[PDB]
Design a protein around this ligand. Structure first.
Ligand SMILES: O=C(NCc1cccc(Cl)c1)c1ccc2c(c1)ncn2CCN1CCCC1
Length: 143
């Protein structure tokens, strides 16, 4: 009657590769980290912003995307653990969700890295408003 659950999917992922020639700063690797929906799902309907926390060696290490694409592209020396906050267009709780993203590079002369990590979010009894956003994004009713 009143109750519903809505699930949506996020994909966090990254690519990393060894540069053929280090940058003049001597950066050895290009990487790119992202949050996206699965194809035919528009997470922008319910995602306010994504906040990527780079290693504090990076200038302005707190990177915000308020619209898609939610990604950071960098060169650097090493991998690190990257906190990632996904903020929702929700007037209620919860307003966001945090992830500990493992941003690892290809050590030695390993082939380049191409990782994906699939996260299912479950929203219980969302407001009709926020519910409209979740379902618009390709969210699904369950329970
Ligand atoms: O690539 C990195 N930063 C790029 C950059 C840009 C501009 C200036 C400077 Cl100085 C650096 C970077 C990445 C990771 C790092 C790091 C720097 N220093 C320690 N770490 C963790 C190393 N630990 C990882 C697990 C064990 C060691």
């Amino acid at each position: 009657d009143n109750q519903c659950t809505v699930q949506v999917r996020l994909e966090l992922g990254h690519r990393a590769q060894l540069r053929k020639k280090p940058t003049t700063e001597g950066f050895t690797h290009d990487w790119m980290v992202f949050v996206r929906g699965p194809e035919q799902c528009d997470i922008q309907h319910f995602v306010e912003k994504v906040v990527f926390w780079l290693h504090d060696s990076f200038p302005k290490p707190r990177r915000v995307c308020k619209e898609p694409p939610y990604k950071v592209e960098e060169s650097g020396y090493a991998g690190f653990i990257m906190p990632i906050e996904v903020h929702f267009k929700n007037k209620e709780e919860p307003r966001k969700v945090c992830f500990t993203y493992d941003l690892f590079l290809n050590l030695e002369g390993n082939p380049p890295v191409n990782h994906l990590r699939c996260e299912k979010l479950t929203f219980n009894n969302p407001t009709t408003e926020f519910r409209y956003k979740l379902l618009r994004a390709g969210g699904v009713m369950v329970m």
